[PDB]
Structure formats: structure tokens, C-alpha cells
């Protein structure tokens, strides 16, 4: 699936991410735009033998198990497949988890490079949340 700005905007909100530990909904809708094009399926390998997965592109190192990475430390106990799904429960849940360690959203590059400190309200304007 490929979400429509507003779509995702709301489903996030429904997944309790609006102000999830300090970060306005905008930051989510944004970080997924730039980081996966709102495409649950997106996948991009990290030269480093790792792989990315889904909407917030969770990594194959410290977050899920692809069985193609050995260092592999599944902080999120989820089989990466689970992140490719139509259902972002998986993805959110682990996000809710990453974002809990002082690097918060800095864990997300696109967010750090192109999202971060922009009027993010943007991302959630025009929507029917």
C-alpha cells in the first residue's frame, strides 16, 4: 500500500503518535514521506549488509530480523517481513520504541535532514483527522 498524506496522517493519530513523547503528528507523516514515499513496501539495503523496511524504514541491525544480518539484535522482536505489511501496527509499535531513546526522531535521517525543524504542521493541514 501507498498512503495518501491525509490517510496516513489519520491512521497515525489513530495509532497514538500525535505528541507521542513530545513529537507532533506532523513529524511522523513527514518522516515517512521523505523516508519511504508513504510506501509500506519500500526497501533499501544498507551497503553494510543491512536492509530497510516499510514506512519509517526500520533497520535490519538493531530492530528486526531478516536472517540476512548476523549482528542482528531484534530490539523490536518483530520479523522484518512484519514491517512490509498493509498493517503498520507493527511499524508504529517499533517506532514508538526507537524514538524512546534520547535520539528520538534523530534516528530518522530524512527527518533529521529534510523534515526536522520545518513547520511540520504543514504535513497535517487539509486533513480530516
Amino acid at each position: 500500500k501507498v498512503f495518501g498524506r491525509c490517510e496516513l496522517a489519520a491512521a497515525m493519530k489513530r495509532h497514538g503518535l500525535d505528541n507521542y513523547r513530545g513529537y507532533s503528528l506532523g513529524n511522523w507523516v513527514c518522516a515517512a514521506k521523505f523516508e519511504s514515499n508513504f510506501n509500506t513496501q519500500a526497501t533499501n539495503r544498507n551497503t553494510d549488509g543491512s536492509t530497510d523496511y516499510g514506512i519509517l524504514q526500520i533497520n535490519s541491525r538493531w530492530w528486526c530480523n531478516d536472517g540476512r544480518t548476523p549482528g542482528s539484535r531484534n530490539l523490536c522482536n518483530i520479523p522484518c517481513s512484519a514491517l512490509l505489511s498493509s498493517d503498520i501496527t507493527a511499524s508504529v509499535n517499533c517506532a514508538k520504541k526507537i524514538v524512546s531513546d534520547g535520539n528520538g526522531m534523530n534516528a530518522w535521517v530524512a527527518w533529521r535532514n529534510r523534515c526536522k525543524g520545518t513547520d511540520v504542521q504543514a504535513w497535517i493541514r487539509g486533513c480530516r483527522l
Partner: antibody, heavy 113, light 108 residues
């Protein structure tokens, strides 16, 4: 599978310092986010703070700045260190992991003169 | 910090009846309210995550719902093995705060 077993003293003098530990065995510690939670006499639970991958720490303001959670990766365990102990600090301290997927027996701790 | 108000205090219920515990957070804390169970002589256990996300290996009798302020967990067709206490915990904001608890008693 994964087992966490808190250890330390039974009692320390007020305004002394209590140090506990939570040897984690079986599963790895390398980064899973761990915590400390206390259950007081009135049966109400209170979260102390936690240790997230990195060495990012957060701590319940309720608990002044008397705390200092920390870990030892070679020795797979992590500790707890409540400084300037006091009466109220009398409760049972437990160690968890992020959510509370896993827990430990708990260990009773008295702060009496 | 942020409070959660667990109502009712106690509940004495008759094996096979349906009950329901509430937990009101004084904040929007949308969706991150999780329930644990602490059965006499032990360390809690997680029942339901986020709000309605049931943990695995827990009875189908347990059901949770809500988001916003008003949050509830329902025990359907109670069982004698359901005597214990139930607390709620938000993880939306720091510090993570627990609820007053609710001692569900089994009518013998």
C-alpha cells in the same frame, strides 16, 4: 527463556545509599531497553527510570536526583543506585524491560534506623 | 506528572459474569495505556499493549478499547483464576505513571 533476577541488600540506614542489581541471564542485554520499578506498601507501583540502547537514561522526577541507573555488558547485568535513602524509600524494587514483557521476583528493601 | 484514575476500587464477581475496569488519564495520551495484572504473591505481567493490542498467551476473555482519555479493559466470563489486581500505565509521557489498581474478587 529470558530471566531477570534482582539482587542486593535487605536493609540500609537512612541517608545511606542502596545499591541493587538485576542479573539478566539467558537473553542478551546488548541494547534491549531496561528499567527499574518500585512497589510501595500501599500497593501502588512507581516507575523509577530506564536504560535505553546507547546509555540514554531517563528518571522519574519524583525520585530526586538520588538515582543513577547503569550497566555492565561484559557481566551482562545492570544496576540501580538510590543515594540519600530514606524511610519512604521502603518498598520493593523490581527490574523490567521497556514494557514489562518480563519481570523479576522483586526484593524487599527497608530503610530504618 | 500525569494521572490515571482507576474506577472502581474493588470488584467481587461471580464466576461466569462479565466485568469492566476503567482508567481515566488526565491527558490526551492517545492509545498508549497498557494493562497489567498482579496476582497475589508475584510480579505483574502485561495483559494488553497500546490499548486493544492483546499480548500473546493471554485469555480471549480479555478485551481492551479506547484512546483519548477514557480507557477500559473488559474481562468476559470471569474465572476464579482472575482474582488479582489490575493497574494501567501510560507510556505517552515521562514519567510513565501507574494507576490506583483494582482488586477483582471471586464470589465463592
Amino acid at each position: 527463556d529470558v530471566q531477570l533476577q534482582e539482587s542486593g541488600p535487605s536493609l540500609v540506614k537512612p541517608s545511606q545509599t542502596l545499591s541493587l542489581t538485576c542479573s539478566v541471564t539467558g537473553d542478551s542485554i546488548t541494547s534491549d531497553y531496561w528499567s527499574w520499578i518500585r512497589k510501595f506498601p500501599g500497593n501502588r507501583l512507581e516507575y523509577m527510570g530506564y536504560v535505553s540502547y546507547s546509555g540514554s537514561t531517563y528518571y522519574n522526577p519524583s525520585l530526586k536526583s538520588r538515582i543513577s541507573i547503569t550497566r555492565d555488558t561484559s557481566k551482562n547485568q545492570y544496576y540501580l543506585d538510590l543515594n540519600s535513602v530514606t524511610t519512604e524509600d521502603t518498598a520493593t524494587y523490581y527490574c523490567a524491560n521497556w514494557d514489562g514483557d518480563y519481570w523479576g521476583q522483586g526484593t524487599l528493601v527497608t530503610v530504618s534506623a | 506528572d500525569i494521572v490515571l484514575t482507576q474506577s472502581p476500587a474493588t470488584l467481587s464477581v461471580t464466576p461466569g459474569n462479565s466485568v469492566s475496569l476503567s482508567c481515566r488519564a488526565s491527558q490526551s495520551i492517545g492509545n498508549n495505556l497498557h494493562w497489567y495484572q498482579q496476582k497475589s504473591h508475584e510480579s505483574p505481567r502485561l495483559l494488553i499493549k497500546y490499548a486493544s493490542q492483546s499480548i500473546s498467551g493471554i485469555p480471549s476473555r480479555f478485551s481492551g478499547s479506547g484512546s483519548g482519555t477514557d480507557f477500559t479493559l473488559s474481562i468476559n466470563s470471569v474465572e476464579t483464576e482472575d482474582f488479582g489486581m489490575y493497574f494501567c500505565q501510560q507510556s505517552n509521557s515521562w514519567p510513565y505513571t501507574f494507576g490506583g489498581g483494582t482488586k477483582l474478587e471471586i464470589k465463592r
